[PDB]
Enzyme design. Structure first.
Site, PDB file in Angstrom:
ATOM      1  N   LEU M  41       7.105  -1.001  32.223  1.00 50.73           N
ATOM      2  CA  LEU M  41       5.681  -0.782  32.042  1.00 50.73           C
ATOM      3  C   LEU M  41       4.887  -1.909  32.687  1.00 50.73           C
ATOM      4  CD1 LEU M  41       4.448  -1.471  28.392  1.00 50.73           C
ATOM      5  CD2 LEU M  41       6.482  -2.519  29.310  1.00 50.73           C
ATOM      6  N   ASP M  42       3.607  -1.639  32.921  1.00 53.13           N
ATOM      7  CA  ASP M  42       2.751  -2.593  33.607  1.00 53.13           C
ATOM      8  C   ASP M  42       2.383  -3.762  32.703  1.00 53.13           C
ATOM      9  OD1 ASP M  42       2.601  -1.364  36.106  1.00 53.13           O
ATOM     10  OD2 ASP M  42       0.936  -0.075  35.497  1.00 53.13           O
ATOM     11  N   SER M  43       1.892  -4.821  33.347  1.00 57.05           N
ATOM     12  CA  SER M  43       1.289  -5.936  32.633  1.00 57.05           C
ATOM     13  C   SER M  43      -0.006  -5.522  31.949  1.00 57.05           C
ATOM     14  CB  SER M  43       1.030  -7.082  33.608  1.00 57.05           C
ATOM     15  OG  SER M  43       0.095  -6.694  34.603  1.00 57.05           O
ATOM     16  N   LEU M  44      -0.666  -4.486  32.476  1.00 60.01           N
ATOM     17  CA  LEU M  44      -1.889  -3.966  31.874  1.00 60.01           C
ATOM     18  C   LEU M  44      -1.611  -3.430  30.475  1.00 60.01           C
ATOM     19  CD1 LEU M  44      -4.289  -1.573  31.561  1.00 60.01           C
ATOM     20  CD2 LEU M  44      -4.823  -3.641  32.858  1.00 60.01           C
ATOM     21  N   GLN M  46       0.958  -4.274  28.787  1.00 58.84           N
ATOM     22  CA  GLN M  46       1.436  -5.437  28.042  1.00 58.84           C
ATOM     23  C   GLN M  46       0.277  -6.179  27.383  1.00 58.84           C
ATOM     24  OE1 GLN M  46       2.320  -9.281  27.032  1.00 58.84           O
ATOM     25  NE2 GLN M  46       1.442  -9.121  29.084  1.00 58.84           N
TER      26      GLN M  46
END
Ligand SMILES: CCCCCCCCCCCCCCCCCC(=O)OC[C@H](COP(=O)(O)OCCN)OC(=O)CCCCCCCCCCCCCCCCC
Lengths: 171, 59, 275, 459, 73, 68, 176, 119, 64, 128, 105, 166, 87
Positions: M41-44, M46
């Site tokens: 999954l993205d850091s966004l 996260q």
């Protein structure tokens, strides 16, 4: 007490309430309970202290004086004549301040007694108060802090000289 | 209980011993806006009525 | 007297919109109440102002105590946000807040009715200044709408606050205190107001739209705050339009004066005096 | 009062031939005996002074100041250990005997008949304080502080002597009583203005007025604690005492040439209360506080009202007590942190939980909290100055606001909120320091109950 | 200290406001909210709390009986 | 296992000073107050009598309170 | 301005703006469902342009994002009432008494609390016991002619505790 | 009101002003009407210690009201009929003052009206 | 028993708080109804507000 | 969207939008790296002065002592009489004094001539 | 220097916002938190001051517009009994009455 | 009657014994909130009595004693009054503050410095009472600045949080 | 003013509210599961996760610590450090 000529009052007046209810009157119950709980032991305390000091006494006397003549009958320098004259004048200044204190006490007494009925049966005291304080304003006011007695005499000469000259050139 | 009303009564005793004697012997002291007598009521000390308020009409 | 009181009353009434702290809402409310009492001294009427002191005293003592019950019941988070729903969860303190806010504006007709509406009636029947009456009328409408907003955002919304809820009233002292002060706010206002010797002239003769008009204005303020709420129910996100920004920074007065006057005098103490 | 003078001469050589570890108890006990002895004098009744063969008399211009000095001596002394404890026994005896000699000349100065004797005892007050602050000033410019002190006090106080010799050989002898009884006004010539300017200017320098108050703050930041309290309280209130003595003569021209001095003191009061807001060096805040209060005192003295003189002596006694106390707490803080700077020593709410109560009580007496006698003084001076000009009350109230502001800022800056967690050497406060606190403030409150004593001779 | 933690996927979202935002954002064409969190906010002892005039006007559900007693006495 | 040791600075020196201060105001507070209570319960103040016909008293006995 | 490095990154700045903008939308947007709508609208706005390989385009859109964010921020955001800025902010600093104290007590008061003081004495013996060799050898071995960073490495070499630990471990519990 | 709007949006001649009210005098055209009831017995009212702006007409009802309230103290609710009688008398006083205002309004309006018809 | 929290569920309610809530709110409402009917007529002020003073003429010598 | 938010002497310009940050050069990154190294070395020396068991007294800050001596007694040197210093001192020293001295001339003339005439409220004006 | 420097950097001095080695800005006596808080304002500076002074001057202008245009119900003066209530104003209890008795309406 | 004055003076004098009690204590109290509770409760039940007498009669009075500095033509004793406002204001403030004592028992249950908190709050109560009883205007000024100082300390209770002492 | 916490209970709460999330799976979910590394999954998302932890636990974690956690174990450790919950 005191002298009721010099600290007078109006005569006391008390109306009698009349219920018109049958509760009856809880404050009467509470003032009777106060009287029997408080007024009798306080009376016994003061009665014991009355007897304990009624054994033996002391006394004290209000101090009175002679009269030194005046500052005006002292010479130009007179270190020991002016001393008596000016300390006699300063004691008059002390007793005169306390006269004004007593008259202001009377004025406050007439204010608090009469409630909102001021201008009936208090105008006598305001009249005599403005009288005595007009005298004080005329005599002891504008003489500064280092008054001894001599500035009072100079103000006296200045005031009667100005009034004499004004009434002469307007007479 | 008993601690509470002796904690209340001993200031009443002290300050009522104070407020009778020294305060009464000082003349211009505790003073009252007098109770308000009425034109139909009477006096406890002297004792007489004031004549009443007059006729009503259109009441 | 009355010009300054009207200025305070309208200033805090306008100022108490979008103030998400509870205690600051109650501060602006009590400043508006003191504006009403300054107008009350703007008429030659001291004893109505004294009666209003008594009613206001029991009133906001009970109100701050209810607010503190809420705030300590949810971990001193203290803000309108993250507090939303409270009704049916310990309804004793919600009951306390709604009794307090209904006593605000004098819901017809309680202890809070008496002093406040004798004040507005004696103000309207007076040689007033054509502006103070209108400002106090608008500010009574505004205290109706922020009383509505503290009710609606503290109680009736969908519940927004975190979990691990410790919402507790297994407690004798708070329920005794809230108990006794709502009993005081119910009766003691009328008890003090009734048996006093009246030191004024009761005017008692008001025209059409001059006696029921206070209740009329408070109810139309409730209508206005209700439609604000129903527009807030939607999903729109319109921009702030600078009355919204004029109300957040407290009319900009504390910000710009507490940033300007400690700069002036202290910079002159640096420049002239200390240097 | 020779029964006050000769026990001071019989107290000094005892300290000289006191053995080791026994100087302290002897000096403290016998100075407290002197304090009860001082309390015996308070007898001034009514019309006159209380005189005593030629040299001595007592007024309420002098009696509470004298009681203040002799009460201040053990407090002075017990502040004055632990910062010369490792020094020699002979140098310790020398310091203590120097303070005893300074007290002796202060009693000589307050119990003076002639203004000539007052001048002799004035610079006799001057001389030991020089040696004390310059020797034990404990900073690199105690040299400069003692030098500014001595040169301003001499160079101002000196033509006062020539004016006093002129008054001597124009009016006979110089008893205060003869000058009450042989005085005559001197009109608006120029030499009258110069003689008045010389006398009042000498005292102005002693006050300090705002034109020459750079005198003070070096001599307060660069002094030991005994000389600090002596300097501030007894020297400034001695200057005001001397002005109150001399201003009985030369009344008619002070209305013509007092208008610059009143103005200079008012605007300097505002500027000094502003300058003691924002400085560093925590000690110096109380120094300019004393400057501001003595400026208020000067305005009160020269506007010539009985209310003003009663408030003037009340403000003198109250500020002497408060400033001496607050200097002693500043010395306690400097014992703690070895700094003298304001922003370093912080916290002191967790730490030292009752020393803070004495800081609070001192700052509230400085603030003019309403049972403090500071407020009685400021209130009477405000009444007199609003009678004087009906518009200068704005400067008074602005002084009032700023005074409460800087005193309470001095409280909450260093002593409200957070230790810097690197100080880690403060011990809990000694019983000696707390003893000096409760020796300062308990007579202040017990004087605040029945304060009819401390008001002036125009009672 | 246990907490006993009423477990996951019990919520199964079903909720009215989150269901509206799922249908509107899927009409936008994204279908990805946070989703299943705030069903505990939106059902339980919650979920048709009283409307605004009901909470204020909650008084006359007990006051009329005592008022009829007050008329009768 | 829940309870925790709170960290106070100290109590000893502060309570010791205030203990000594209350005991040493109380040390000669009880004799002075009890003695003056014995004075105004036994000996009395004075009466308000007047200077008689040809008599000169002391410079004291012009005062109300006996200890005065 | 941060202890690790000086530059954050472009990504770190974008991300901090993301967290601040989302928090401001939380503050704007009560009843929480319109919040979920507008928050996923914001997430859509930042996934408009996932495929950005350019750099000047990204930083210019970031500057315009700062413009469009400062154009519409909220004056009193919901800041958490334990954080700095919030409603607590060391609210219960009434009892955060530092722990170099509790060593200047009277010995009867030290007789009141025996075992805790024995344990504190052996902790203090542990503190002075392992200062010299480990901490001096690490603080002369691992630093270059400039230290040039602030996060410090542990005593991973041989034995006992990592250096510079006393006033980081023995802090008060934040509930005193 | 609206009379205020008429006075501020017409002319200041025909519409009267308070606090300078008696301008066309009393007994202008009276049929010998002056009675002025005055059943106050004002010295007894001084004895009852009333308020300024209450030493006026409709105060004998206030005397009886204070009499019953003083003499019947735990009655929190009984003394209200004399209270309403006092309010009715002050209502009559209010109608009297409004009659005085609108009478001056009508006098001034019709007299300036007639001299404008003749001028 | 003591008080216990819960996780994301509607809290527990002892019936004492709800009986005092009902009691206090509904006694306020009984008070305001017994205040509105039984005694006052404080919203409506006991006196008909008149017309302009009489709408009558030949009043004390009006000028024709 | 906006006039780009000017700062003032009071309005802080935040580090979000400078906008002059975004023109980074290599020397600016070198400057930020040197700044980080300076604070790193000063904190390292601070911690090593700060973490001994044998240290009892204060942390011995040189920066605060530097600022106090530079603010207290290192103001009088340096100093030179410019037009700016002399004019500003003469405008802040005697200006307000001569201003309020003129207004007290005016008010004392009014009070003297007024009670010289006799039209004051001193029917009773006691507390002189 | 003080409403900037967010407190999550965790430097040394927890309230002075200083990390023990800095130039220690010349106004450290005044620019601290708790004395002068120079946070960035949410809107502007000139816009703030012009709106505030505009609102206050508008309120004073309408205060003056209210002071020149009073309001009043149609109500005459009071009818005091003893000739505009003598004997309880300023005085002269038996010297100067001004006879103006009220005539009925 | 002296009963009225005596009960007003005991409603003043009941607000002293907790403060001097904790200052002279030396043996630690834990039921000090109970002590403040019962003394403020009896102060309320003894202040409801003179207002009952007040509406029963009228009968307004002022008391004054122990004059000091009767220097010039004026003087001042500790002098305070009881007319309509100081009658029907004092039990209101006492009732409010007794409920606030209850709510501070529960709300401030956790801080172990509750005794100094009650000292500050009760001293503030004393000073506000002295403001709302006095007729000598100097004593009104005393009550004025005293409640100012108590407001200062009682806001700045939580040391730290520089917003609060600001 | 006393809710107590534990390590195991607060770890179960953090794993619970991670399991509640939509576009990850409870299939392969455990405490030793990195976000950006091997959950894809993205850091966004996260930082949406760290936003959820802040919005539940009621205290702001700093923006320097919204960078470098990436796994539930260090999340539970950091929350237990900020709340100071041990025995
Ligand atoms: C007359 C001469 C008065 C001279 C006063 C000089 C004051 C200098 C010290 C100012 C001070 O104490 O500043 C601290 C305080 C800061 O408070 P603030 O910035 O509002 O913090 C909360 C924001 N979140 O700032 C303040 O308290 C600001 C000062 C108070 C306002 C004084 C003037 C108000 C009335 C203006 C005219 C009407």
């Amino acid at each position: 007490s005191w002298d009721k000529d010099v600290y007078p009052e109006p005569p006391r007046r008390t109306p009698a309430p009349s219920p018109q209810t049958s509760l009856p009157n809880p404050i009467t119950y509470l003032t009777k309970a106060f009287d029997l709980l408080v007024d009798r032991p306080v009376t016994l305390v003061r009665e014991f202290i009355e007897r304990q000091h009624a054994k033996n006494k002391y006394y004290y006397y209000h101090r009175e004086f002679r009269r030194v003549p005046d500052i005006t009958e002292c010479h130009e320098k007179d270190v020991l004549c002016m001393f008596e004259a000016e300390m006699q004048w300063k004691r008059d200044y002390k007793v005169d301040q306390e006269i004004v204190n007593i008259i202001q006490e009377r004025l406050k007494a007439c204010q608090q007694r009469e409630g909102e009925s001021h201008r009936q049966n208090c105008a006598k005291e305001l009249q005599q108060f403005t009288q005595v304080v007009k005298a004080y304003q005329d005599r002891y006011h504008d003489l500064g802090a280092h008054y001894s007695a001599r500035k009072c005499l100079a103000k006296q000469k200045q005031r009667m000289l100005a009034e004499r000259k004004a009434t002469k050139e307007a007479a | 209980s008993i601690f509470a009303f002796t904690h209340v009564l001993i200031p009443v005793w002290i300050i009522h011993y104070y407020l009778k004697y020294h305060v009464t012997t000082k003349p211009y002291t505790i003073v009252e806006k007098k109770p308000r007598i009425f034109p139909g009521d009477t006096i406890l000390e002297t004792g007489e009525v004031i004549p009443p308020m007059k006729e009503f009409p259109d009441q | 007297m009355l010009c300054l009181g009207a200025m305070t009353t309208l200033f805090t009434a306008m100022c108490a919109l979008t103030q998400n702290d509870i205690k600051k809402i109650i501060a602006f409310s009590t400043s508006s109440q003191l504006g009403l009492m300054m107008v009350t001294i703007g008429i030659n009427q001291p004893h109505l102002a004294f009666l209003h002191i008594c009613t206001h005293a029991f009133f906001k003592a009970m109100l701050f105590m209810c607010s503190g019950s809420i705030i300590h019941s949810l971990n001193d988070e203290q803000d309108i946000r993250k507090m939303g729903g409270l009704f049916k969860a310990m309804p004793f303190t919600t009951t306390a807040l709604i009794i307090g806010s209904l006593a605000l504006t004098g819901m017809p007709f309680l202890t809070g009715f008496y002093s406040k509406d004798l004040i507005i009636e004696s103000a309207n029947t007076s040689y007033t200044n054509a502006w103070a009456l209108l400002m106090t009328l608008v500010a009574t409408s505004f205290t109706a709408i922020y009383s509505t907003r503290i009710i609606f955002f503290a109680l009736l919304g969908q519940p927004r606050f975190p979990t691990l809820i410790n919402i507790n009233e297994n407690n004798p002292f708070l329920i005794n205190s809230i108990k006794r002060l709502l009993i005081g706010s119910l009766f003691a206002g009328f008890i003090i107001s009734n048996n006093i010797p009246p030191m004024t002239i009761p005017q008692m003769t008001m025209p059409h739209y001059l006696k029921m008009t206070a209740l009329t204005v408070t109810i139309l303020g409730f209508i206005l705050a209700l439609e604000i709420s129903n527009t807030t129910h939607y999903l729109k996100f319109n921009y702030p339009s600078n009355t919204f920004k004029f109300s957040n920074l407290l009319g900009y007065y504390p910000t710009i004066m507490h940033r300007l006057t400690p700069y002036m005098n202290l910079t002159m103490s640096q420049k002239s005096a200390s240097s | 009062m020779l029964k006050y003078i000769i026990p001071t001469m019989m107290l000094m050589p005892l300290t000289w031939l006191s053995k080791n570890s026994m100087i302290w108890i002897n000096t403290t006990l016998h100075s407290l005996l002197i304090s009860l002895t001082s309390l015996l004098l308070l007898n001034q009744f009514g019309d006159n002074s209380l005189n005593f063969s030629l040299t001595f008399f007592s007024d309420s211009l002098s009696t509470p100041l004298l009681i203040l000095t002799m009460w201040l001596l053990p407090l002075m002394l017990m502040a004055s250990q632990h910062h010369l404890s490792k020094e020699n026994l002979a140098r310790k005896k020398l310091f203590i005997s120097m303070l005893i000699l300074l007290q002796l000349f202060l009693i000589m100065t307050f119990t003076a008949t002639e203004l000539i004797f007052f001048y002799i005892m004035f610079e006799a007050t001057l001389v030991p304080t020089l040696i004390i602050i310059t020797r034990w000033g404990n900073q690199t410019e105690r040299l400069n502080a003692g030098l500014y002190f001595l040169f301003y006090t001499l160079a101002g106080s000196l033509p006062l002597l020539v004016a006093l010799i002129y008054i001597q050989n124009t009016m006979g002898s110089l008893n205060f009583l003869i000058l009450q009884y042989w005085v005559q006004p001197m009109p608006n010539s120029w030499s009258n203005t110069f003689m008045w300017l010389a006398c009042m200017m000498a005292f102005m320098v002693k006050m300090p007025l705002y034109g020459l108050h750079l005198w003070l703050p070096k001599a307060h930041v660069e002094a030991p604690i005994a000389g600090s309290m002596v300097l501030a309280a007894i020297l400034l209130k001695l200057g005001g005492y001397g002005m109150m003595r001399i201003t009985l003569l030369l009344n008619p021209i002070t209305d013509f040439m007092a208008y610059p001095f009143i103005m200079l003191s008012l605007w300097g009061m505002i500027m000094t209360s502003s300058i003691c807001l924002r400085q560093t060096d925590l000690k110096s805040l109380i120094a300019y506080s004393s400057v501001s209060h003595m400026a208020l005192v000067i305005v009160a003295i020269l506007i010539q009202t009985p209310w003003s003189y009663m408030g003037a002596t009340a403000l003198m006694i109250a500020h002497g007590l408060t400033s001496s106390m607050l200097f002693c707490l500043a010395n306690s803080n400097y014992e703690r942190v070895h700094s003298r700077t304001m922003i370093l020593a912080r916290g002191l709410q967790t730490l030292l939980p009752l020393m803070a109560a004495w800081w609070l009580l001192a700052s509230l007496t400085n603030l003019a909290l309403p049972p403090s006698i500071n407020l009685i003084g400021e209130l009477f001076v405000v009444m007199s100055t609003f009678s004087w000009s009906n518009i200068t009350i704005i400067l008074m109230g602005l002084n009032m606001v700023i005074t409460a502001l800087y005193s309470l800022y001095m409280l909450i800056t260093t002593q409200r909120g957070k230790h810097t967690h690197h100080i880690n050497n403060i011990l809990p406060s000694f019983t000696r320091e707390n003893a000096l606190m409760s020796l300062h403030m308990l007579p202040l409150l017990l004087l605040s109950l029945n304060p009819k004593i401390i008001l002036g001779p125009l009672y | 200290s246990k907490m006993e933690l009423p477990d996951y996927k019990q919520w199964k979202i079903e909720g009215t406001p989150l269901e509206t935002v799922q249908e509107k954002l899927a009409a936008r064409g994204l279908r990805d909210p946070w989703g299943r969190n705030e069903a505990w906010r939106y059902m339980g002892g919650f979920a048709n709390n009283v409307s605004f005039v009901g909470a204020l006007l909650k008084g006359f559900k007990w006051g009329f009986a005592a008022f009829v007693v007050a008329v009768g006495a | 296992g829940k309870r925790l040791f709170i960290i106070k600075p100290s109590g000893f020196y502060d309570k010791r000073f205030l203990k000594l201060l209350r005991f040493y105001i109380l040390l000669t507070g009880i004799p002075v107050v009890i003695g003056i209570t014995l004075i105004n319960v036994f000996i009395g103040e004075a009466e308000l009598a007047e200077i008689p016909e040809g008599y000169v008293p002391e410079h004291w006995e012009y005062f109300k309170h006996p200890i005065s | 301005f941060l202890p690790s490095a000086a530059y954050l990154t472009h990504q770190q700045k974008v991300l901090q703006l993301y967290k601040r903008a989302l928090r401001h939308l939380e503050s704007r947007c009560v009843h929480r469902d319109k919040y979920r709508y507008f928050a996923c609208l914001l997430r859509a706005r930042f996934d408009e342009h996932k495929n950005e390989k350019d750099m000047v385009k990204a930083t210019q859109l970031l500057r315009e994002a700062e413009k469009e964010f400062w154009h519409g921020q909220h004056p009193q955001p919901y800041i958490f009432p334990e954080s700095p800025g919030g409603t607590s902010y060391e609210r219960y600093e009434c009892y955060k008494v530092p722990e170099w104290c509790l060593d200047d007590w009277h010995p009867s008061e030290k007789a009141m609390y025996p075992d805790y003081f024995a344990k504190r004495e052996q902790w203090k013996k542990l503190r002075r016991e392992s200062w010299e060799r480990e901490v001096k050898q690490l603080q002369e071995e691992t630093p270059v002619g400039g230290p040039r960073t602030e996060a410090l490495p542990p005593a991973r070499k041989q034995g006992d505790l990592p250096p510079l630990w006393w006033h980081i471990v023995t802090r008060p519990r934040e509930r005193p | 009101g609206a009379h205020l709007a008429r006075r501020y949006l017409g002319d200041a001649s025909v519409e009267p002003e308070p606090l300078r009210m008696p301008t066309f005098p009393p007994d202008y055209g009276f049929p010998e009407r002056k009675e002025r009831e005055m059943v106050a017995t004002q010295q007894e009212m001084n004895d009852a210690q009333l308020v300024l702006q209450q030493r006026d007409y409709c105060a004998h009802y206030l005397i009886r009201f204070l009499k019953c309230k003083r003499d019947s103290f735990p009655n929190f609710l009984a003394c209200k009929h004399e209270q309403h009688d006092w309010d009715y008398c002050e209502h009559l006083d209010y109608v009297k003052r409004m009659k005085e205002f609108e009478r001056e309004r009508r006098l001034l309006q019709r007299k300036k009206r007639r001299e404008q018809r003749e001028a | 028993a003591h008080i216990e929290p819960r996780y994301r569920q509607f809290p527990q309610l002892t019936r004492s708080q709800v009986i005092q809530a009902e009691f206090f709110s509904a006694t306020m409402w009984f008070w305001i109804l017994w205040r509105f009917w039984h005694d006052s007529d404080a919203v409506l002020g006991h006196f008909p507000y008149p017309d302009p003073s009489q709408w009558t003429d030949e009043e004390l010598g009006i000028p024709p | 969207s906006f006039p780009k938010y000017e700062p003032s002497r009071l309005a802080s310009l935040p580090t979000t939008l400078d906008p002059a940050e975004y023109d980074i050069s290599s020397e600016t990154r070198k400057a930020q790296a040197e700044r980080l190294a300076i604070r790193s070395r000063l904190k390292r020396e601070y911690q090593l002065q700060y973490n001994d068991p044998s240290r009892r007294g204060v942390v011995e800050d040189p920066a605060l002592i530097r600022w106090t001596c530079a603010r207290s007694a290192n103001v009088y040197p340096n100093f030179r009489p410019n037009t700016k210093t002399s004019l500003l001192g003469a405008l802040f020293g005697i200006g307000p004094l001569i201003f309020w001295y003129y207004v007290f001339k005016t008010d004392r003339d009014r009070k003297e001539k007024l009670i010289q005439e006799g039209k004051l409220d001193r029917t009773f004006n006691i507390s002189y | 220097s003080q409403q900037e420097r967010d407190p999550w950097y965790d430097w040394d001095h927890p309230d002075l916002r200083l990390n023990w080695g800095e130039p220690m800005h010349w106004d450290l006596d005044m620019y601290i938190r708790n004395r002068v808080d120079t946070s960035p304002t949410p809107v502007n500076w000139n816009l703030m001051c012009k709106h505030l002074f505009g609102f206050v001057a508008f309120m004073l202008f309408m205060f003056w517009v209210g002071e020149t245009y009073p309001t009043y119900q149609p109500v005459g003066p009071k009818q005091y009994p003893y000739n505009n209530l003598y004997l309880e104003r300023g005085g002269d209890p038996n010297k100067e009455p001004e006879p103006v008795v009220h005539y009925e309406i | 009657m002296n009963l009225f004055s005596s009960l007003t003076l005991v409603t003043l004098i009941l607000l002293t014994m907790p403060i001097a009690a904790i200052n002279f204590n030396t043996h630690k109290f834990t039921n000090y909130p109970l002590y403040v509770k019962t003394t403020i409760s009896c102060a309320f039940i003894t202040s409801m009595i003179p207002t009952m007498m007040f509406i029963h009669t009228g009968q307004e009075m002022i008391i004054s004693n122990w004059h000091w500095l009767t220097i010039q033509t004026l003087k001042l004793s500790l002098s305070f009054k009881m007319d309509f406002f100081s009658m029907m204001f004092v039990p209101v403030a006492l009732f409010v503050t007794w409920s606030i004592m209850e709510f501070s028992m529960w709300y401030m249950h956790s801080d172990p410095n509750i005794n100094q908190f009650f000292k500050y709050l009760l001293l503030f109560l004393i000073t506000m009472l002295i403001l709302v009883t006095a007729n000598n205007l100097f004593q009104l000024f005393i009550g004025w600045e005293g409640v100012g100082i108590m407001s200062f300390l009682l806001i700045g209770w939580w040391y730290g949080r520089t917003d609060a002492n600001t | 003013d006393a809710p107590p916490l534990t390590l195991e209970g607060i770890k179960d709460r953090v794993l619970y509210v991670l399991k509640l999330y939509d576009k990850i799976d409870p299939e392969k979910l455990s405490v030793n599961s990195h976000f950006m590394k091997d959950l894809g999954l993205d850091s966004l998302d996260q930082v949406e996760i760290i936003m959820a932890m802040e919005d539940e636990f009621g205290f702001e974690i700093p923006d320097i610590d919204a960078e470098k956690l990436m796994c539930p174990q260090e999340i539970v450790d950091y929350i237990a450090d900020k709340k100071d919950v041990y025995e």
